[PDB]
Amino acid sequence: VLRPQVFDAADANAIEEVNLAYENV
Amino acid sequence: MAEVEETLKRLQSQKGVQGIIVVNTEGIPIKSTMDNPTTTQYASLMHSFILKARSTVRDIDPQNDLTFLRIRSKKNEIMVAPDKDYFLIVIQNPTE
Amino acid sequence: MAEVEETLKRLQSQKGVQGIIVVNTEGIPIKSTMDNPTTTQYASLMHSFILKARSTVRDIDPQNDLTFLRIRSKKNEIMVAPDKDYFLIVIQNPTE
Amino acid sequence: NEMFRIFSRFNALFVRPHIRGAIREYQTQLIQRVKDDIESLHDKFKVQYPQSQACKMSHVRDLPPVSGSIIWAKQIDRQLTAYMKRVEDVLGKGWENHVEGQKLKQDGDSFRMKLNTQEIFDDWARKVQQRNLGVSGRIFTIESTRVRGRTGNVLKLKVNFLPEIITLSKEVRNLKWLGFRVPLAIVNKAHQANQLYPFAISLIESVRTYERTCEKVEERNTISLLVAGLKKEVQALIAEGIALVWESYKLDPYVQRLAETVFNFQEKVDDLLIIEEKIDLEVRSLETCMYDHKTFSEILNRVQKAVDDLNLHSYSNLPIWVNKLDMEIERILGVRLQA
Amino acid sequence: EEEKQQILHSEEFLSFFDHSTRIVERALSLEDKEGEIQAGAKLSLNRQFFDERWSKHRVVSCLDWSSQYPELLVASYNNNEDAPHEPDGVALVWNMKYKKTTPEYVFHCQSAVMSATFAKFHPNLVVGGTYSGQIVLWDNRSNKRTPVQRTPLSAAAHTHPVYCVNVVGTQNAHNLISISTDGKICSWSLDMLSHPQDSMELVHKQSKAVAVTSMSFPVGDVNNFVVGSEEGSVYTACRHGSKAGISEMFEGHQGPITGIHCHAAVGAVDFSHLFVTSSFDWTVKLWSTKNNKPLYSFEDNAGYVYDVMWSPTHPALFACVDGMGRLDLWNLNNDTEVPTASISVEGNPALNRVRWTHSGREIAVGDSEGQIVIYDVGEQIAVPRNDEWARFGRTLAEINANRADAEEEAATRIPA
Amino acid sequence: EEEKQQILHSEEFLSFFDHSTRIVERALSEQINIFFDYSGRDLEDKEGEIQAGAKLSLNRQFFDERWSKHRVVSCLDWSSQYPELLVASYNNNEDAPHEPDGVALVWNMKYKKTTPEYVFHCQSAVMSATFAKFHPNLVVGGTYSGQIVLWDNRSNKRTPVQRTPLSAAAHTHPVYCVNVVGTQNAHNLISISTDGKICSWSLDMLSHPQDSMELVHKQSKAVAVTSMSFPVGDVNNFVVGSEEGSVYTACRHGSKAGISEMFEGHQGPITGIHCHAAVGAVDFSHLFVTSSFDWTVKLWSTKNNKPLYSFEDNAGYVYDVMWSPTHPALFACVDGMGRLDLWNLNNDTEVPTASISVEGNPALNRVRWTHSGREIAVGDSEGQIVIYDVGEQIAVPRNDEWARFGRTLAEINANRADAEEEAATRIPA
């Protein structure tokens, strides 16, 4: 959708939230 | 035993150099592995220009020594120096 | 004119130059860089070699850069440069 | 396409049911898009299969027209099956099991019936059975078909086969590819016809070449007498072919001799064309000759060179052609004499 | 020759040449048009060729060009189908340099011609085969419009209507391959037309021969080629030796083989196992060599595909032609499902074939309408770097992984 | 004789002689020697010193006398079409008051010759000097009065070809800033006067600017445009600094077209400020940097009216500063002491990566690096030109250095959060 490729604060927040939820799990 | 071929390739793969063809002492194109008509015509015109340049040199001084006449020609500018032994082409772009 | 004079002075700003002749086809120089009699003699040589070079270029290709042809010799790096109306020639050192 | 893109985006996300309600709501839009696609497919089917420019291109792909209609029906069926499978997948389990899905499935079955390649194939097989033709032996069926509005019997030296027969063999191969069911006796007859086609194609090409030789004769009837011997050879070959029959086992060697005759006739036609260019140039030079006696001598030298070339040619009626050329030269010289 | 070599190999002359070459090397050591290289110059239909002397009532025979004369492309027009008075065989040529719709040579013929090619192996001449199936060869050197060489199809020769033929081998050894409708695999000698160099009515699957609707050999594959059946059974076509012939009928399609070519792209990643293929069932599916199943597919148009071929430079990009009147070229690393730039035919005209430039800066487009248009190509994605070829090979390995993952997900996701 | 003098004075013939001398200089620049040794046997001592400061290497010195004396480097621009070309805007020749107040000069990267390839001579001091972004052979700059002039690099007449209008409605204040902006199709010759006259002009028309607007904010307090920059692709957005030490965003469109933001952290008139000129794997449009006459450099952010970070190591009032065009970490600066302060924060943050103040304090006022940023022209006011080459180990940023640059920016956010928490808790009761 909006991944880094040829910014997006909300998309970065969603990706970081997924990563942090995985880390917490 | 390949210094001549190496030098021919170096002056041939040189930047801006459109060709380094070994022509005879009279200037007729000996090494001509391409369209011999245009190459021989260019070599003969180069010999004529070399005669004119030798005439200019003698107008300065006959027995002078020459490094390379840098003739500015749009088709092929020649930084060459002809002789009475052979004629290997030295014509490269100043920008290359 | 004076801009061309400054251009000649800058091309001759390099010290040790034997002589550079802004030239003309009439056998006399527009601006030479030597004594007047030798300037006229070398400028006649310049006009003769200029006609010879124009003819030799037309023999090679009559659709080339009709401005100049250097001759970097081991005796004098003759940077001949004739225009359509005026002319020039710089019998210089090979280093510059 | 948009539904496929959304499904590709959300296929991996089948676990979290956060968008189950969104999918249920958008099922109406998906059904509308599916109905639009079904209507577009119905419009494409309503477009005549031969009437498709793609149908013409497939005929250009060596598609015999019955086989092309069958292939168009099969491709439409494949596309419709793909659309139905995509609709079922988008609806998930019961993608057709829902009420609207079952209605769409009934509509697709009706569209498949309207795409009754079984029915079109039954019609084609009935047409083939109704044809049921067969003929061999005296292949060169010279049909002197009368001209369009004129009585001129254009001697169509038809071969012992029809182009419909060749199309039938090709379409038989195509129907085998499409899994068609056809008649075995007709299949054996088509195998015999294909065997005859190994020389039948040469015969048809020979007919085309004979037509070309006749057309060249029509174009250059002025030098047409000059090729009297070659024309006689061609007529003799034509008579031999008319007398022959493919029941005689020498049909292949006879076709080979006729094709050699055809190649020789083409070569003679080319030589005559070059000579005709030279002769027309000579005639024009005579017509517009500059009044130089040396000019006339040069024209005569060219004429003598052309005469030597003709002597090398060995065409038909050389002295008579020379007489005609000399008379023409006399006419040109008489104009020059008046001048 | 020898005297010139001795002049170049004279010790005084050689030493002087070496010293002078070293010394010379030391001494000599509009604006908006540039903004569409990826945005329109990647595919710019420039040379729309329509010579009404042939553009009237005729079709396009095939696609050919001169590797010997790279500025030259052969405009293979088919028979004047709606003009019986006009001849059924003639040739045209489109010049990349010269701005003339006229051919460099018009190889005439009596009959309708299916396939043809130029000859870099024999730069003076070209060759072609009839739609009926008789082969022929013509030379631009000569003065006769018809092809001087004419390999006549017969019962002995390739009686079935030939469509696949290629000049197999360079000027060192040229045995010009051919294939009938039944696929008479017929190498033809570079100077002999009475007898072809070889001939093979090959068959496979318990000798059940079929109509190979496509064929493609690898680079230097004197002993291999492709055989793509119109039945959809892509036979493995070994080309030389006693093992030559239709080996393995790969099944990676659902229709007759519409467009197919070898993985002509050249780069760091070797695509020797790859296979590009399109079917007549409106489905183009790229196949694999060892895996007879298709590697990946693209079936956008409900109509069939005019042509399909792997791009000669970019492993990611490819050259395909669709019957929906739309351009078909997708950069696999960039755009795999959707095409990279799905342009449309002018009026969605019926296309026949395509012929990419050897430098890749252009590509032909088939046109049954008559205006034979060629799309000028940029270097945005067609230019494959070795790392870009390495990136494409990584993408290919990832595609293999995704195919295995799709197989596993289908195994774990079948509802019943 | 007289005919020879006329032919020398003949305009076509003199122009041909000038092009001839130009190609002569091109050939004499191509005139390399014949006794060369390219094997590199003379670079070992350089390699023996490369491990101690090869990141800096002055290339040439485009120094003259025909217009250099009493003429500072007023502005610098590297030509977009020809990156091998750089300009040299001259100050008012006080020593040559007989000569006019502005004569442009070309610092050449294509060749090493003191003779400039292009010159634009005019009677006004060239305050701004913008090269043609979308054109190949055009020259324009800002007068000391403010009326923008026109010239051509390819031409053979140094005079101001066209002049912009000069009026109360026109640029009465000196043209502080001017640049070639707008699209290739929809261009905008944006210029800034001292009073705040945002002057979007037209290349075709030297009478009516495309958009002229005097600027004022903070209850319409007059805008002394000191620091100038703008966002890439945001023609509306532009960066504004004040001699009163006030920073602001500039809007070209919109109902508030004009001073958009309002920032202030400096203790001097805004001397040197360039946008974050490096674009890589991270988009950092929301931040910038600034410097003033208070011996300090203040980083900036889009949402932060308070300055982002401080580079205050200067022992004297700064003149110019520029973020690097390729490496996000790197950023070069200048002052009246020649304070070359190329500072790569990822490399060296507390100290600059390359902090080189000029011995004798050369007056580095205006400068422009290479288009790739590989070299940066630096020059004293008297005309001591230095084009320092960049060591690629320091010059080329890492691929992750944009992701790591975002990481370092977040680290700076955390450190500044610690500082701001210290500021909040340090207030006593």
From Swiss-Prot, chains B, C:
GO MF term list: dynein intermediate chain binding; identical protein binding; microtubule motor activity
GO biological process, one term: microtubule-based movement
Tissue note: High expression in heart, liver, brain and pancreas; moderate in placenta, skeletal muscle and kidney; low in lung, prostate, testis, small intestine and colon. Isoform 1 expression is up-regulated in 64% hepatocellular carcinoma (HCC) patients.
Cellular-component GO terms for this entry: centrosome; ciliary tip; cilium; cytoplasm; cytoplasmic dynein complex; dynein complex; membrane; microtubule
Gene3D superfamilies: Dynein light chain 2a, cytoplasmic
Keyword field: Acetylation, Cytoplasm, Cytoskeleton, Dynein, Microtubule, Motor protein, Transport
Compartment(s) where it occurs, according to its Swiss-Prot or TrEMBL record: Cytoplasm, Cytoskeleton
Pfam family membership, one: Robl_LC7
Matches recorded under SUPFAM superfamilies: Roadblock/LC7 domain (SSF103196)
Principal location: cytoplasm
PTM sites of type N-acetylalanine: A2
Keyword Phosphoprotein: no
Function field: Acts as one of several non-catalytic accessory components of the cytoplasmic dynein 1 complex that are thought to be involved in linking dynein to cargos and to adapter proteins that regulate dynein function. Cytoplasmic dynein 1 acts as a motor for the intracellular retrograde motility of vesicles and organelles along microtubules.
Family named by the database record: Belongs to the GAMAD family.
Complexes and interactors: Homodimer. The cytoplasmic dynein 1 complex consists of two catalytic heavy chains (HCs) and a number of non-catalytic subunits presented by intermediate chains (ICs), light intermediate chains (LICs) and light chains (LCs); the composition seems to vary in respect to the IC, LIC and LC composition. The heavy chain homodimer serves as a scaffold for the probable homodimeric assembly of the respective non-catalytic subunits. The ICs and LICs bind directly to the HC dimer and the LCs assemble on the IC dimer. Interacts with DYNLRB2. Interacts with DYNC1I1 and DYNC1I2.
Protein name: Dynein light chain roadblock-type 1
UniProtKB/Swiss-Prot annotation, chain D:
Signal peptide residues on this chain, from the entry's feature table: none
Function summary: Cytoplasmic dynein 1 acts as a motor for the intracellular retrograde motility of vesicles and organelles along microtubules. Dynein has ATPase activity; the force-producing power stroke is thought to occur on release of ADP. Plays a role in mitotic spindle assembly and metaphase plate congression.
Subunit note: Homodimer. The cytoplasmic dynein 1 complex consists of two catalytic heavy chains (HCs) and a number of non-catalytic subunits presented by intermediate chains (ICs), light intermediate chains (LICs) and light chains (LCs); the composition seems to vary in respect to the IC, LIC and LC composition. The heavy chain homodimer serves as a scaffold for the probable homodimeric assembly of the respective non-catalytic subunits. The ICs and LICs bind directly to the HC dimer and dynein LCs assemble on the IC dimer. Interacts with DYNC1LI1; DYNC1LI1 and DYNC1LI2 bind mutually exclusive to DYNC1H1.
Similarity field: Belongs to the dynein heavy chain family.
Domain remark from Swiss-Prot or TrEMBL: Dynein heavy chains probably consist of an N-terminal stem (which binds cargo and interacts with other dynein components), and the head or motor domain. The motor contains six tandemly-linked AAA domains in the head, which form a ring. A stalk-like structure (formed by two of the coiled coil domains) protrudes between AAA 4 and AAA 5 and terminates in a microtubule-binding site. A seventh domain may also contribute to this ring; it is not clear whether the N-terminus or the C-terminus forms this extra domain.
Name of protein: Cytoplasmic dynein 1 heavy chain 1
Encoding gene per record: DYNC1H1
Complete-protein stretch covered: 579 to 917 of 4646
Curated annotation (Swiss-Prot), chain F:
Main location: cytoplasm
Record-level GO cellular component terms: centrosome; cytoplasm; cytoplasmic dynein complex; cytosol; dynein complex; microtubule; vesicle
GO BP annotations, alphabetical order: microtubule-based movement; transport along microtubule
Parts of the chain that traverse the membrane: none
PTM statement from Swiss-Prot or TrEMBL: Pyrophosphorylation by 5-diphosphoinositol pentakisphosphate (5-IP7) promotes interaction with DCTN1. Serine pyrophosphorylation is achieved by Mg(2+)-dependent, but enzyme independent transfer of a beta-phosphate from a inositol pyrophosphate to a pre-phosphorylated serine residue.
Flavoprotein as UniProt keyword: no
GO molecular function, one term: dynein light chain binding
Organism superkingdom: Eukaryota
Compartments (UniProt record): Cytoplasm, Cytoskeleton; Cytoplasm
Keywords: Acetylation, Cytoplasm, Cytoskeleton, Disease variant, Dynein, Host-virus interaction, Intellectual disability, Microtubule, Motor protein, Phosphoprotein, Repeat, Transport, WD repeat
WD repeats: 68-117, 121-161, 170-211, 220-260, 265-310, 313-353, 359-398
Purpose of the protein: Acts as one of several non-catalytic accessory components of the cytoplasmic dynein 1 complex that are thought to be involved in linking dynein to cargos and to adapter proteins that regulate dynein function. Cytoplasmic dynein 1 acts as a motor for the intracellular retrograde motility of vesicles and organelles along microtubules. The intermediate chains mediate the binding of dynein to dynactin via its 150 kDa component (p150-glued) DCTN1. Involved in membrane-transport, such as Golgi apparatus, late endosomes and lysosomes.
Family membership noted in the UniProt record: Belongs to the dynein intermediate chain family.
Protein name: Cytoplasmic dynein 1 intermediate chain 2
Organism per entry: Homo sapiens
